[PDB]
């Protein structure tokens, strides 16, 4: 295999982008109630993720390319000084402000993609 579950947490994003299905598997009365509570919460956070992947056209993807051009206002950094230097945790602390802005940009591109796809299959 590879390193394991989160084993590339302090690794470069280039090596960490490989084998992402190791963290895609393990993502899914006082004792009984507090055990069932965590069970329902787990399904919620997971579904919230699949929900996002669905309304982005990535439902069923681990690596998913899109249409939204990378705005340099988010980060004027090269592909090289990101994927061969910064770790995934460092990176999204830098995109932390712009993460809720890109999320909106991905939904319009999926809604304006099937809207066009609808016109395509009208012929």
């Amino acid at each position: 295999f590879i390193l394991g579950f989160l084993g590339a947490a302090g690794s470069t994003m280039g090596a960490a982008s490989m084998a992402l299905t190791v963290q895609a598997r393990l993502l899914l009365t006082v004792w009984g109630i507090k055990q069932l509570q965590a069970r329902v919460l787990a399904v919620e956070r997971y579904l919230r993720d699949q929900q996002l992947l669905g309304i982005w056209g990535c439902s069923g993807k681990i690596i998913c390319c899109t249409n939204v051009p990378w705005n340099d206002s988010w980060s004027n950094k090269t592909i090289n000084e990101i994927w061969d230097n910064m770790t995934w945790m460092q990176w999204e602390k830098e995109i932390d402000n712009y993460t809720q802005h890109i999320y909106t940009l991905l939904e319009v591109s999926q809604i304006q993609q099937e809207k066009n796809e609808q016109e395509l299959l009208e012929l």
Partner: nanobody
Amino acid sequence: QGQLVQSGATTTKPGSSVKISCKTSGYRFNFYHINWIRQTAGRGPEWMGWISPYSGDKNLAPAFQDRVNMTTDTEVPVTSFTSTGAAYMEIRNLTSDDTGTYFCAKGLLRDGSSTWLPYLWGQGTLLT
């Protein structure tokens, strides 16, 4: 994005050996190699070798193999992405031809094809 302060200007005589320090701060010392370069009055610049603060690996030019004693400490973590370490540089058969300015240089990246490329330089130390 951190400082690489070295030792002073210690001048000895031929045959002896000098220790040069290189203390880091402001960057994860284990993530990037440490290179050693110098500019002698007689040649131009000359690459001596680098060392890995994590792999413990050493790779020097064949011109400086049987003369260089190169080591490192172990970084003392300041934050999750900061640390403070130190590299050490010694030489064996010392002469007056080796007189010049020496510095240490932190590597450029952590992956790719330009990982060790001496990016961040120190301050410089004048030898014999």
